[PDB]
């Protein structure tokens, strides 16, 4: 689906809208795109550097700035602000798929 499709919710509530399988899948795809695409004014990918360094310290914490995601994809920011548990459950898998692109064995230890 599209971001404009996610702008208009078919369900009455946000809780069962994100819970829907196709909506969850396209939200996961958009979050993976957010981690892959985003870059700073300098030009380096801040999220790639964060993933590389958290793999370096073997730590499982990812620091995602909300302002970056708001200025990149605002509908996901509203979705995360209003229904945090369901968005964070998907975005955990998104972050693991992002860090799987560099370290295949990282899913084995953590």
């Amino acid at each position: 689906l599209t971001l404009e499709s996610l702008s208009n919710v078919k369900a009455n509530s946000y809780s069962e809208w994100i819970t829907q399988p196709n909506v969850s899948r396209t939200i996961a795809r958009e979050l993976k795109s957010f981690l892959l695409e985003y870059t700073d004014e300098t030009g380096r990918s801040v999220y790639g550097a964060r993933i590389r360094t958290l793999g370096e310290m073997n730590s499982e914490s990812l620091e995602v700035n909300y302002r970056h995601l708001a200025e990149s994809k605002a509908i996901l920011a509203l979705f995360l602000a209003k229904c945090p548990e369901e968005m964070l459950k998907i975005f955990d898998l998104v972050a693991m798929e992002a860090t799987e692109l560099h370290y295949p064995d990282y899913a084995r230890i953590h």
């Binding site: 870059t39 030009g43 380096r44 990918s45 999220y47 790639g48 990149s72 692109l101 560099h102």
Partner: protein
């Protein structure tokens, strides 16, 4: 065509050593999941083909990226947000290709199994009904250090198929496979000198005693071939820095002072099942009678051998040869 060929070649060189390449994931059009599997397949095929050319692919977007391939249309790049990636690409002078342009680029820059073959494979290797990737049960798989003497076509038997458990190879002295431990005193290098050592004093004494006998024998050996290989003929010998048996002896004194029968290739399942049930409690093979014998002299006195001896119709060729060799 030649100028196009050289232009494509030197652009291949430049896109090899100075191009960072990034692929896009997001889509602008609502489209089905079963068609999304098609999108995943085309992305994976173009990935493996571009790996086949040998270009290294980085997963993350960056400012060092040169050419971007996207699924979204080339027409829409003008009418998008600043925060979108295509605006960043056109700002930083990056070339953007769609699958139409990229597939045209890849093609411009470069059998059915049939039913009878499938049924023939069905007869030999069983069903194709299961998952091919999973380990089939009635075929052994190696988990231990092995040697596997097989053939590619697999028409002939996997010839010598043998692995060892770590408990068997634990010993550093006896090993099932040969090791090059060399040795000394004319012995074979693989067995070595495990039984006894040549550094002992008594062994040195017996070797020196045999050496005394060998001097006279070795003198003619040196003298015959000193200058000529043939007998077309006092001796000169090269000094050596390395030690000797006599100097070591001197140092020790200073310290002191079946043909067999051919058998079938394949064995039976009941025969292999009987190997697990076995516990503990001059000779040769005659090919004329094609039997094993405990002793030769008992095989001489036997009805089949004596009946073979009295017959002369099986040495007829021999007989003809005898006759020829009589009047040569």
């Amino acid at each position: 065509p030649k100028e196009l060929l050289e232009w494509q070649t030197n652009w291949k060189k430049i896109m090899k050593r100075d191009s960072r390449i990034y692929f896009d994931i997001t889509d602008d059009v609502e489209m089905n999941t079963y068609n999304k599997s098609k999108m995943d397949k085309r992305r994976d095929l173009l990935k493996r083909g571009f790996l086949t050319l040998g270009a290294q692919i980085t997963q993350f977007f960056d400012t060092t990226v040169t050419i971007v391939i996207t699924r979204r249309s080339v027409e829409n790049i003008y009418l998008l947000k600043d925060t979108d990636i295509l605006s960043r690409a056109k700002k930083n002078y990056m070339k953007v290709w769609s699958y139409e342009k990229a597939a045209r680029f890849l093609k411009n820059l470069d059998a059915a199994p049939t039913l009878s073959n499938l049924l023939h494979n069905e007869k030999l290797y069983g069903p194709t009904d299961r998952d091919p990737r999973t380990k089939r049960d009635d075929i052994h798989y190696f988990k231990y250090p092995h040697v596997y003497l097989y053939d590619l076509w697999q028409t002939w038997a996997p010839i010598i198929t043998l692995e060892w458990k770590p408990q068997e190879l634990t010993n550093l002295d006896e090993l099932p496979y040969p090791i090059l431990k060399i040795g000394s005193f004319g012995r074979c290098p693989f067995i070595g000198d495990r039984n006894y050592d040549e550094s002992s004093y008594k062994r040195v004494v017996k070797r020196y005693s045999r050496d005394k006998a060998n001097k006279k024998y070795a003198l003619q050996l040196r003298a015959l071939f000193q200058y000529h290989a043939d007998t077309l003929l006092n001796l000169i010998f090269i000094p050596h820095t390395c030690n000797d048996s006599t100097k070591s002896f001197k140092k020790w004194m200073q310290e002191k002072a079946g043909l067999g029968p051919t058998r079938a290739s394949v064995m039976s399942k009941n025969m292999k099942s009987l190997s697990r049930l076995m516990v503990d409690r001059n000779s040769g093979y005659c090919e004329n009678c094609r039997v094993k014998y405990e002793s030769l002299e008992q095989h001489i006195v036997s009805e089949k051998h004596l009946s073979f001896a009295e017959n002369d119709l099986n040495f007829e060729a021999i007989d003809s040869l005898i006759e020829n060799l009589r009047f040569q």
